[PDB]
Amino acid sequence: GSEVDMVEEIDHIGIISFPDFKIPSNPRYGMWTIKAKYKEDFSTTGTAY
Amino acid sequence: CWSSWSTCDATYKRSRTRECNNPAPQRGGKRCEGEKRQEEDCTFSIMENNGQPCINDDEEMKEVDLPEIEADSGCPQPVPPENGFIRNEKQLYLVGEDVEISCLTGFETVGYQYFRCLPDGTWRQGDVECQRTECIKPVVQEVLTITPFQRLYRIGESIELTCPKGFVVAGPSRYTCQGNSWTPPISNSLTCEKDTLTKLKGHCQLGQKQSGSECICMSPEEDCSHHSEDLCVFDTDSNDYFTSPACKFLAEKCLNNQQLHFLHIGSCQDGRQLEWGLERTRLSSNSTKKESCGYDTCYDWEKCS
Amino acid sequence: ESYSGVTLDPRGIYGTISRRKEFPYRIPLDLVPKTEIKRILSVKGLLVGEILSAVLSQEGINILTHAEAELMSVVPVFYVFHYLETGNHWNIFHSDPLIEKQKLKKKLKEGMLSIMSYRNADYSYSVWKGGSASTWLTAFALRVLGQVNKYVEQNQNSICNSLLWLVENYQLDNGSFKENSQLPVEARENSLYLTAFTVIGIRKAFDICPLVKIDTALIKADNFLLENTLPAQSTFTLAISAYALSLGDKTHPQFRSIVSALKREALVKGNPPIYRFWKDNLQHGTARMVETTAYALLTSLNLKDINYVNPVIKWLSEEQRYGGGFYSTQDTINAIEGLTEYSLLVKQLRLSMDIDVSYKHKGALHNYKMTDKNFLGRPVEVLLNDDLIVSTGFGSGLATVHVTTVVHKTSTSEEVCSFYLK
Ligand SMILES: *[C@@H]1O[C@H](CO)[C@@H](O)[C@H](O)[C@H]1NC(C)=O
Ligand SMILES: *[C@@H]1O[C@H](CO)[C@@H](O)[C@H](O)[C@@H]1O
């Protein structure tokens, strides 16, 4: 349930490409989570696993 | 009417003076009924609340509730290690949140000090403990006047406690703290009792005090059960060598037997050398009085000097 | 084995300032032949909850420049002047910031000249003409004077002798304080107020004029509040004594027991609480509860806790509080100070910290730049074997660095396991 890393990216296309994430030297096994927000000014959320 | 309403001032409750002037004279007989000036509190706001304000009436204790919703999946407030002290106190912690623990005065956190909330309601409880860097001044009593005097004491430092100007603490006089933190009793405390060497108001100890006229004597055995160091005395027609605790020495010498008096000295365990000094106690009123040195044995038994 | 971690404090908010931390590189005897030791590091923390409210600006137009009330007149000015510097906003008025600030200093210059008239040749302070002596005014005045030292200046030799008169005379052997100027159980409560009130004033001026005899007095002063506040007497009594002790050592065992006893007497509104307040009377211009909350607020602000403070500020921002307060300014000044201390605490944590993790004898591994946008840090592998040292610049905020060392350990170490198996 602990947050790992955050990344912000500009969207030109409508398809937002993000730099590849990576698993830490000593990973914590289980089902991870990916949440997305529009930052300013919207509250729109998304969740991936 | 009413007039004189003023802006907030010196003290100041707004004056609002009242005059009886409507009438005007008169056959006399007279005046009017009421108070001339109120003199009600003045108000002020800083304020900028926006305001509005909008408020309703409700109160809680610690209200029972319970506030806890486990559908939100979060941990309760954790129990700190020995000597406790968790910072940023909360009622409910979120999953994945970690809270740092610190030690009360005075110690030092040793090892990894943090508590992380698991997906399940328990805590990680990483290895941590509290090592004692410094030991703190005991509660004791106002009688001392304790040395050395600091806020806290480092390991290896010893403290000395004495009760002036009279009496004594009777022990322990000095103790060092390795945590540890000595062994002072806080239950019975110390409460220094007047020394036997103190001349001033020494006969009032058995008095009690506050009654009646006031302090004189206590009897028969009610002054006993105390340590009462042993002393060897002889009197009252029985005339044996005896021995006796200091409890009954000041007992036998009192309103009761002092008319037949009593005798004397000590501190002999009865004994070898000091015995022949009592031999030798046979000269008292013979043939007139006792003038030698302290041959009168003072009157109230002193040091003497 | 995580085995280590530290919370970096740039401003030294909690106790001492913490910047540099050395993570030692050690080799256990249980180590497997060959292999290696791997270490990972990350950073996180802060995220202040709410910005909440503010104060003034009508007060500047209301009370700034707007017989014996001269004291009450100039007293809040010092507390008001502190907020303006803490909030750092003089920009609200049409006039130039320097024109306003320099105009305010003249009011404080007259304020120190107005408080000088209340000083007797005894170096103490008296209310009317110097006819009688009161410890209360001598204490209350020392709070205001302690505020000046952070701004303009004050002469030590002239101020220091004012503190001596309390220890030389008015400090009881029991540690309690009393004044000359004038239900048996009521006597204990009245002593705690007089004790705590003096502890505040003295603690304020103690830093400007360090003295061994005064420092000795504080040990006996605070210790009196620790042992005698054990039973519950009055919330207001408990509040002031808690704040006086909050100015001292906050890590004291008996102090936490006092704070805990104070939090139980606290009243709230909402689940979770929207507002948190304190009411003195049990089963009870008329509102005296503003003082007990202001002391409790300042107590938690000195404990540097946002979460507990936020509901209290909401209560002092807008309430049935009116007011509706007296002396004054004895009630108001503690609210101004609370809002002054609060605006500081919010400013105290900006998470502007810049963290640089490097090896002791080797080059920089990585550097984290913490902001409001990024409050988090990515796990970084520590492979090469050397002492690891993480440090920070000046910055603003609070952050916690965690470093875990993963080392494969045999198991041929049964010397530790105490079991021979075949
Ligand atoms: C001391 O003096 C008188 C003198 O005649 C003698 O009778 C008496 O027995 C002696 N007193 C004592 C107490 O032995
Ligand atoms: C004096 O009082 C009466 C009522 O007490 C009002 O008519 C009047 O305006 C004034 O306040």
mmCIF file with all atom_site columns, N, CA, C and O in Angstrom, chain A residues 1 23-32, chain B residues 119 124:
data_model
loop_
_atom_site.group_PDB
_atom_site.id
_atom_site.type_symbol
_atom_site.label_atom_id
_atom_site.label_alt_id
_atom_site.label_comp_id
_atom_site.label_asym_id
_atom_site.label_entity_id
_atom_site.label_seq_id
_atom_site.pdbx_PDB_ins_code
_atom_site.Cartn_x
_atom_site.Cartn_y
_atom_site.Cartn_z
_atom_site.occupancy
_atom_site.B_iso_or_equiv
_atom_site.pdbx_formal_charge
_atom_site.auth_seq_id
_atom_site.auth_comp_id
_atom_site.auth_asym_id
_atom_site.auth_atom_id
_atom_site.pdbx_PDB_model_num
ATOM 1  N N  . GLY A 1 1   ? 0.817  -1.203 0.000   1.00 0.00 ? 1   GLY A N  1
ATOM 2  C CA . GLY A 1 1   ? 0.000  0.000  0.000   1.00 0.00 ? 1   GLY A CA 1
ATOM 3  C C  . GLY A 1 1   ? 0.845  1.245  0.000   1.00 0.00 ? 1   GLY A C  1
ATOM 4  O O  . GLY A 1 1   ? 0.298  2.348  0.037   1.00 0.00 ? 1   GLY A O  1
ATOM 5  N N  . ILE A 1 23  ? 11.321 -2.429 -11.419 1.00 0.00 ? 23  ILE A N  1
ATOM 6  C CA . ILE A 1 23  ? 11.169 -3.059 -10.128 1.00 0.00 ? 23  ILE A CA 1
ATOM 7  C C  . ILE A 1 23  ? 12.439 -2.855 -9.329  1.00 0.00 ? 23  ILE A C  1
ATOM 8  O O  . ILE A 1 23  ? 13.511 -3.202 -9.832  1.00 0.00 ? 23  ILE A O  1
ATOM 9  N N  . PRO A 1 24  ? 12.322 -2.301 -8.085  1.00 0.00 ? 24  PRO A N  1
ATOM 10 C CA . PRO A 1 24  ? 13.441 -2.012 -7.170  1.00 0.00 ? 24  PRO A CA 1
ATOM 11 C C  . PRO A 1 24  ? 14.343 -3.198 -6.921  1.00 0.00 ? 24  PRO A C  1
ATOM 12 O O  . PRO A 1 24  ? 13.903 -4.334 -7.110  1.00 0.00 ? 24  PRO A O  1
ATOM 13 N N  . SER A 1 25  ? 15.596 -2.951 -6.477  1.00 0.00 ? 25  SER A N  1
ATOM 14 C CA . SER A 1 25  ? 16.564 -4.035 -6.228  1.00 0.00 ? 25  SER A CA 1
ATOM 15 C C  . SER A 1 25  ? 15.993 -5.149 -5.350  1.00 0.00 ? 25  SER A C  1
ATOM 16 O O  . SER A 1 25  ? 16.200 -6.339 -5.637  1.00 0.00 ? 25  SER A O  1
ATOM 17 N N  . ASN A 1 26  ? 15.238 -4.756 -4.313  1.00 0.00 ? 26  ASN A N  1
ATOM 18 C CA . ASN A 1 26  ? 14.577 -5.704 -3.440  1.00 0.00 ? 26  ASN A CA 1
ATOM 19 C C  . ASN A 1 26  ? 13.060 -5.465 -3.512  1.00 0.00 ? 26  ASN A C  1
ATOM 20 O O  . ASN A 1 26  ? 12.498 -4.731 -2.692  1.00 0.00 ? 26  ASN A O  1
ATOM 21 N N  . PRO A 1 27  ? 12.410 -6.073 -4.521  1.00 0.00 ? 27  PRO A N  1
ATOM 22 C CA . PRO A 1 27  ? 10.983 -5.934 -4.769  1.00 0.00 ? 27  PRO A CA 1
ATOM 23 C C  . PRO A 1 27  ? 10.145 -6.461 -3.627  1.00 0.00 ? 27  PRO A C  1
ATOM 24 O O  . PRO A 1 27  ? 10.594 -7.322 -2.862  1.00 0.00 ? 27  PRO A O  1
ATOM 25 N N  . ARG A 1 28  ? 8.912  -5.948 -3.519  1.00 0.00 ? 28  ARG A N  1
ATOM 26 C CA . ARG A 1 28  ? 7.947  -6.418 -2.539  1.00 0.00 ? 28  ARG A CA 1
ATOM 27 C C  . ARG A 1 28  ? 6.884  -7.138 -3.324  1.00 0.00 ? 28  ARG A C  1
ATOM 28 O O  . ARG A 1 28  ? 6.129  -6.503 -4.055  1.00 0.00 ? 28  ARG A O  1
ATOM 29 N N  . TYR A 1 29  ? 6.877  -8.473 -3.248  1.00 0.00 ? 29  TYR A N  1
ATOM 30 C CA . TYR A 1 29  ? 5.970  -9.305 -4.049  1.00 0.00 ? 29  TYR A CA 1
ATOM 31 C C  . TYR A 1 29  ? 4.495  -9.132 -3.722  1.00 0.00 ? 29  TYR A C  1
ATOM 32 O O  . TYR A 1 29  ? 4.115  -8.965 -2.547  1.00 0.00 ? 29  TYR A O  1
ATOM 33 N N  . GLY A 1 30  ? 3.669  -9.187 -4.771  1.00 0.00 ? 30  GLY A N  1
ATOM 34 C CA . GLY A 1 30  ? 2.238  -9.049 -4.627  1.00 0.00 ? 30  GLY A CA 1
ATOM 35 C C  . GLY A 1 30  ? 1.676  -8.342 -5.822  1.00 0.00 ? 30  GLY A C  1
ATOM 36 O O  . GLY A 1 30  ? 2.345  -8.233 -6.852  1.00 0.00 ? 30  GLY A O  1
ATOM 37 N N  . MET A 1 31  ? 0.431  -7.881 -5.696  1.00 0.00 ? 31  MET A N  1
ATOM 38 C CA . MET A 1 31  ? -0.255 -7.169 -6.760  1.00 0.00 ? 31  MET A CA 1
ATOM 39 C C  . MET A 1 31  ? -0.036 -5.672 -6.618  1.00 0.00 ? 31  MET A C  1
ATOM 40 O O  . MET A 1 31  ? -0.563 -5.065 -5.684  1.00 0.00 ? 31  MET A O  1
ATOM 41 N N  . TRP A 1 32  ? 0.725  -5.072 -7.536  1.00 0.00 ? 32  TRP A N  1
ATOM 42 C CA . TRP A 1 32  ? 0.985  -3.636 -7.509  1.00 0.00 ? 32  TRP A CA 1
ATOM 43 C C  . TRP A 1 32  ? -0.195 -2.872 -8.048  1.00 0.00 ? 32  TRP A C  1
ATOM 44 O O  . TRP A 1 32  ? -1.184 -3.471 -8.483  1.00 0.00 ? 32  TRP A O  1
ATOM 45 N N  . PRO B 2 119 ? -1.491 -3.990 5.052   1.00 0.00 ? 119 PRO B N  1
ATOM 46 C CA . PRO B 2 119 ? -2.820 -4.064 4.463   1.00 0.00 ? 119 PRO B CA 1
ATOM 47 C C  . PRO B 2 119 ? -3.801 -4.616 5.497   1.00 0.00 ? 119 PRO B C  1
ATOM 48 O O  . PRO B 2 119 ? -4.908 -4.111 5.630   1.00 0.00 ? 119 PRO B O  1
ATOM 49 N N  . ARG B 2 124 ? 3.897  -3.375 11.298  1.00 0.00 ? 124 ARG B N  1
ATOM 50 C CA . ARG B 2 124 ? 5.153  -4.048 10.968  1.00 0.00 ? 124 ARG B CA 1
ATOM 51 C C  . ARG B 2 124 ? 6.006  -4.248 12.183  1.00 0.00 ? 124 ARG B C  1
ATOM 52 O O  . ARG B 2 124 ? 6.552  -5.339 12.368  1.00 0.00 ? 124 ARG B O  1
#
